[PDB]
Amino acid sequence: VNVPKTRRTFCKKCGKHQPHKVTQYKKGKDSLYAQGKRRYDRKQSGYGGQTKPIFRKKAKTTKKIVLRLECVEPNCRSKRMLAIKRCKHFELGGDKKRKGQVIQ
Amino acid sequence: TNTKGKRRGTRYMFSRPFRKHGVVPLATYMRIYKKGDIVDIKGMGTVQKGMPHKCYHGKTGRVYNVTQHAVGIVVNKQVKGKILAKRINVRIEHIKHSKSRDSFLKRVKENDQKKKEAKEKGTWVQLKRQPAPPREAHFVRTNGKEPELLEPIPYEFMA
């Protein structure tokens, strides 16, 4: 699909429609010192083989893409996640498709 | 098994009749509806938002909520073992007035008028309804002529 990098939409902190800077959300590092991560580390340390399941029945072909909407106006700097439906092609600023053109 | 879709088998139900397609007429948009009005439901294929489910097509309930351009109605659905008074929000175009109450209201008005009449007179007038009575025995006359003799027709093969 195609989304632009700017979006005049609602902001939670201001309470009005302001232009937000649009980019794509990605996962972060697990940081190794979370509660469930340290619980899994201690439950895995020692004998016993492996204590928690490894999921190996992948059936989806794509992901729900998430836009990271960041406000443009200073002194607010508000960020917000916005999920769109499942698509396997995705781009920003991607070729506005030019209605009234020869397709060859 | 079948499918569990919302419009499964609505080819003739949620469709428009013959030579009555096109623009929905405007008096249908501008009927008025109050609370407690007895209202039947008939789905229309043109207007598609606010459409009721096909298990309410032909059912009749009472109005509990009147919104801006829709009407809430308490209908009766028999869910296999019991009748449930359940509330559905149906848009205006899928909604007519039920005239089953109008004859009752005119009969109540006629009974109130015929009760105010002949009250100071002292006479007792029957106000209830009564079914089809025996046909009040009479004379069947003829002006001299005899009844026409009917005859069973002789058989002949058509094809």
Binding site: - | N65, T67, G72, N76, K80, G81, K82, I83, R87
Partner: protein
């Protein structure tokens, strides 16, 4: 080892054994589902119905006096 899938054979008999009922119709039905602005403002009307009690009681007393004068003219 196949089996029977679906039927509705004895079900209507089972349903009509215990007497399929009309729903419990009560006077003063609930207001769950009514639009919130109209519920809000009927709540304001029921809140401010206590204002004007002396006018209502005085006009009911004058209505009693009017019915007394009417029944005096009738009798």
């Amino acid at each position: 080892a196949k089996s029977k899938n679906h039927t509705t054979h004895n079900q209507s008999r089972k349903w009509h054994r215990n007497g399929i009922k009309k729903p419990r119709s009560q006077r003063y039905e609930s207001l769950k589902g009514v639009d919130p602005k109209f519920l809000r403002n009927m709540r304001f009307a029921k809140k401010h119905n206590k204002k004007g009690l002396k006018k209502m009681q005085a006009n009911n007393a004058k209505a009693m006096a009017a019915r007394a004068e009417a029944i005096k003219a009738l009798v």
